Design a protein around this motif. Sequence first.
Motif, PDB file in Angstrom:
ATOM      1  N   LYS A   1      54.852  38.500  39.429  1.00  0.00           N
ATOM      2  CA  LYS A   1      54.621  37.712  38.216  1.00  0.00           C
ATOM      3  C   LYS A   1      53.224  37.895  37.583  1.00  0.00           C
ATOM      4  N   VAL A   2      52.253  38.324  38.388  1.00  0.00           N
ATOM      5  CA  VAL A   2      50.866  38.464  37.932  1.00  0.00           C
ATOM      6  C   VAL A   2      50.262  39.690  38.565  1.00  0.00           C
ATOM      7  N   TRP A   3      49.487  40.470  37.807  1.00  0.00           N
ATOM      8  CA  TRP A   3      48.816  41.630  38.405  1.00  0.00           C
ATOM      9  C   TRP A   3      47.573  41.995  37.594  1.00  0.00           C
ATOM     10  N   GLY A   4      46.663  42.766  38.197  1.00  0.00           N
ATOM     11  CA  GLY A   4      45.399  43.097  37.545  1.00  0.00           C
ATOM     12  C   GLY A   4      45.221  44.584  37.536  1.00  0.00           C
ATOM     13  N   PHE A   5      44.565  45.107  36.528  1.00  0.00           N
ATOM     14  CA  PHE A   5      44.272  46.535  36.497  1.00  0.00           C
ATOM     15  C   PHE A   5      43.048  46.697  35.564  1.00  0.00           C
ATOM     16  N   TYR A   6      42.494  47.902  35.520  1.00  0.00           N
ATOM     17  CA  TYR A   6      41.244  48.112  34.852  1.00  0.00           C
ATOM     18  C   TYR A   6      41.380  49.226  33.794  1.00  0.00           C
ATOM     19  N   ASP A   7      41.197  48.858  32.528  1.00  0.00           N
ATOM     20  CA  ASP A   7      41.058  49.813  31.439  1.00  0.00           C
ATOM     21  C   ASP A   7      39.603  50.264  31.479  1.00  0.00           C
ATOM     22  N   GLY A   8      39.312  51.415  32.104  1.00  0.00           N
ATOM     23  CA  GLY A   8      37.929  51.752  32.276  1.00  0.00           C
ATOM     24  C   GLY A   8      37.332  50.723  33.206  1.00  0.00           C
ATOM     25  N   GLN A   9      36.309  50.024  32.722  1.00  0.00           N
ATOM     26  CA  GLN A   9      35.700  48.999  33.521  1.00  0.00           C
ATOM     27  C   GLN A   9      36.164  47.663  33.078  1.00  0.00           C
ATOM     28  N   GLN A  10      37.112  47.644  32.156  1.00  0.00           N
ATOM     29  CA  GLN A  10      37.570  46.411  31.579  1.00  0.00           C
ATOM     30  C   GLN A  10      38.737  45.845  32.375  1.00  0.00           C
ATOM     31  N   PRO A  11      38.530  44.665  32.950  1.00  0.00           N
ATOM     32  CA  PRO A  11      39.638  44.070  33.731  1.00  0.00           C
ATOM     33  C   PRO A  11      40.714  43.444  32.899  1.00  0.00           C
ATOM     34  N   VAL A  12      41.955  43.757  33.231  1.00  0.00           N
ATOM     35  CA  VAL A  12      43.068  43.201  32.508  1.00  0.00           C
ATOM     36  C   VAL A  12      44.000  42.441  33.466  1.00  0.00           C
ATOM     37  N   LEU A  13      44.299  41.203  33.144  1.00  0.00           N
ATOM     38  CA  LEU A  13      45.219  40.418  33.930  1.00  0.00           C
ATOM     39  C   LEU A  13      46.511  40.280  33.124  1.00  0.00           C
ATOM     40  N   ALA A  14      47.551  40.945  33.619  1.00  0.00           N
ATOM     41  CA  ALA A  14      48.892  40.828  33.138  1.00  0.00           C
ATOM     42  C   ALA A  14      49.600  39.585  33.687  1.00  0.00           C
ATOM     43  N   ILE A  15      50.276  38.859  32.807  1.00  0.00           N
ATOM     44  CA  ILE A  15      51.013  37.633  33.248  1.00  0.00           C
ATOM     45  C   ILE A  15      52.405  37.628  32.700  1.00  0.00           C
TER      46      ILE A  15
ATOM     47  N   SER B   1      32.350  45.093  39.261  1.00  0.00           N
ATOM     48  CA  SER B   1      33.469  44.914  38.296  1.00  0.00           C
ATOM     49  C   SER B   1      34.848  45.164  38.936  1.00  0.00           C
ATOM     50  N   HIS B   2      34.959  46.341  39.543  1.00  0.00           N
ATOM     51  CA  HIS B   2      36.191  46.788  40.162  1.00  0.00           C
ATOM     52  C   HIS B   2      36.630  46.035  41.435  1.00  0.00           C
ATOM     53  N   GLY B   3      35.932  45.004  41.860  1.00  0.00           N
ATOM     54  CA  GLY B   3      36.363  44.269  43.032  1.00  0.00           C
ATOM     55  C   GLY B   3      36.873  42.898  42.613  1.00  0.00           C
ATOM     56  N   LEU B   4      36.933  42.664  41.307  1.00  0.00           N
ATOM     57  CA  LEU B   4      37.227  41.342  40.814  1.00  0.00           C
ATOM     58  C   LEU B   4      38.598  40.822  41.247  1.00  0.00           C
ATOM     59  N   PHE B   5      39.648  41.632  41.042  1.00  0.00           N
ATOM     60  CA  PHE B   5      41.022  41.249  41.403  1.00  0.00           C
ATOM     61  C   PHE B   5      41.212  41.129  42.912  1.00  0.00           C
ATOM     62  N   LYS B   6      40.628  42.061  43.661  1.00  0.00           N
ATOM     63  CA  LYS B   6      40.515  41.913  45.125  1.00  0.00           C
ATOM     64  C   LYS B   6      40.050  40.496  45.458  1.00  0.00           C
ATOM     65  N   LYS B   7      38.941  40.061  44.827  1.00  0.00           N
ATOM     66  CA  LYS B   7      38.300  38.776  45.097  1.00  0.00           C
ATOM     67  C   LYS B   7      39.125  37.549  44.773  1.00  0.00           C
ATOM     68  N   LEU B   8      39.966  37.634  43.735  1.00  0.00           N
ATOM     69  CA  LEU B   8      40.828  36.526  43.312  1.00  0.00           C
ATOM     70  C   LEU B   8      42.140  36.432  44.066  1.00  0.00           C
ATOM     71  N   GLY B   9      42.407  37.448  44.860  1.00  0.00           N
ATOM     72  CA  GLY B   9      43.673  37.611  45.496  1.00  0.00           C
ATOM     73  C   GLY B   9      44.776  38.017  44.563  1.00  0.00           C
ATOM     74  N   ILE B  10      44.451  38.844  43.562  1.00  0.00           N
ATOM     75  CA  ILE B  10      45.438  39.298  42.559  1.00  0.00           C
ATOM     76  C   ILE B  10      45.800  40.754  42.882  1.00  0.00           C
ATOM     77  N   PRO B  11      47.083  41.032  43.135  1.00  0.00           N
ATOM     78  CA  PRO B  11      47.510  42.398  43.435  1.00  0.00           C
ATOM     79  C   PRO B  11      47.456  43.297  42.171  1.00  0.00           C
ATOM     80  N   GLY B  12      47.405  44.611  42.409  1.00  0.00           N
ATOM     81  CA  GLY B  12      47.475  45.592  41.317  1.00  0.00           C
ATOM     82  C   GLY B  12      47.037  46.921  41.837  1.00  0.00           C
TER      83      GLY B  12
END
Length: 449
Positions: free
Chosen positions: A42-56, A1-12
Amino acid sequence: SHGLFKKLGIPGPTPLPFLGNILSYHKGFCMFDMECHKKYGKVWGFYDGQQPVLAITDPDMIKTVLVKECYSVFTNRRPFGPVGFMKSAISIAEDEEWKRLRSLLSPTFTSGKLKEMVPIIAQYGDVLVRNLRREAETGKPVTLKDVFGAYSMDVITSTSFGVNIDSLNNPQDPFVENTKKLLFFLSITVFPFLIPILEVLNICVFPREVTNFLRKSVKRMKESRLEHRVDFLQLMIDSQNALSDLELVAQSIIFIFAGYETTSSVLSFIMYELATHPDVQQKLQEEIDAVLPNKAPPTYDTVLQMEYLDMVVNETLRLFPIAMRLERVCKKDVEINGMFIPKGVVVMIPSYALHRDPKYWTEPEKFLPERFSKKNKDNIDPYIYTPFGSGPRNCIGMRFALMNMKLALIRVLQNFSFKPCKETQIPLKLSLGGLLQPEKPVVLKVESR
Ligand code: HEM
Ligand SMILES: CC(C)c1nc(CN(C)C(=O)N[C@H](C(=O)N[C@@H](Cc2ccccc2)C[C@H](O)[C@@H](N)Cc2ccccc2)C(C)C)cs1
């Protein structure tokens, strides 16, 4: 779960096991989002618990999520806590269930039903000034949320249900007293896998005591109408010839809460801005005196003619966007504006951050109503500026809210000016809970004109 943004190339910000980014919330939602915006762009990712959130933050992308792909991909908000029969409320409901409620309740706030409410809201406006007049007679500091909330409760319950519960004249009001107490999430976001457990346990995020009262109360109101006009309550009654009794009560509790609490908080924030910017309050009183000569009763049309009142309401909502973030769940893998979004990611629009962004607003920390004049009404992007969301799931009560607030405003400013005192917290500061509220209550003096 926690590697998702790493994988997309999304900073956070890097997540902790289990907690995700939850600790960054110590300083409040607003600041977290503001910092992430400054740090990541302009775009970033973070995790509410295990829940991934993509801010835009990109206007085009926002439109796509809030508007163009509302029905296909981005229909629903995040599932919410243990909620009981409140699962049926329009704000929490999902897909088809959401659509049919939206369609059923959409007529509550048409132009014509608004106009027909002005007469009713105006009788409460006179009781409101009457109340403030007595308090102005003593010079006693006024806590506006009490006086505004009593007014807000009277208005919503009589416009929606046809009942005068007389909140303004009743200090012990069960309705206000209960409706506020209907208000932990830290533990659950670290553990969402619990919510489904808590159906069995039939516990809730509001006391059973409050929902008991409201259920009873609305049931009484239904039956009252059964043994006239067309309101929010008739609409739901008419559908029942496909709404169940619990569903009806669910939508009632949402409207009752939102009509009471959002209106009263925004009205207190406005008054704070007017008290601390005398020139803005003076100029608003001149518009109102010119549109309504000799203290004339507000009407639908005359509320539409108040260009400065509209600029003051909008500017307060820029600074104080009580939702603070909008959200939608991505319901299937999708690529929008060059970017891949996986299913079950929460897409989040940080309104409070965007309302304060120096790329979009000159001096964004300052109360400047004039940024909303017809001169600049065009420099303002409707996807950056989102006090009421946008698209098919925007705030259904938006026009009710604006009109109700404006009427309260016209009446009160026709009769009084508001000033700070020893009790006003200057630089107002915001509470650091997940609700946009002042650290201390807005208290101001009230003086007769
Ligand atoms: C100044 C006052 C208000 C503000 C700033 C406000 C803001 C919001 C926002 C930001 C949302 C989320 C929209 C989105 O996600 O795009 C929302 C939704 C909603 N609001 Fe309001 N609101 C206010 C007053 C009201 C009132 C008075 C009512 C009821 C009479 C109301 C009823 C609702 C409902 C039912 C939803 C969910 C709509 C749906 O899910 O289909 N709001 N509002
Ligand atoms: C600050 C923001 C990030 C959030 N707040 C919550 C919890 N609350 C307090 C809430 O009202 N939730 C929603 C709801 O139905 N919000 C109602 C009313 C309500 C909810 C629960 C019980 C009784 C009434 C509020 C109102 O309809 C809008 N006019 C106000 C609004 C909208 C979006 C975000 C913040 C404020 C729902 C999204 C769980 C979850 S996320």
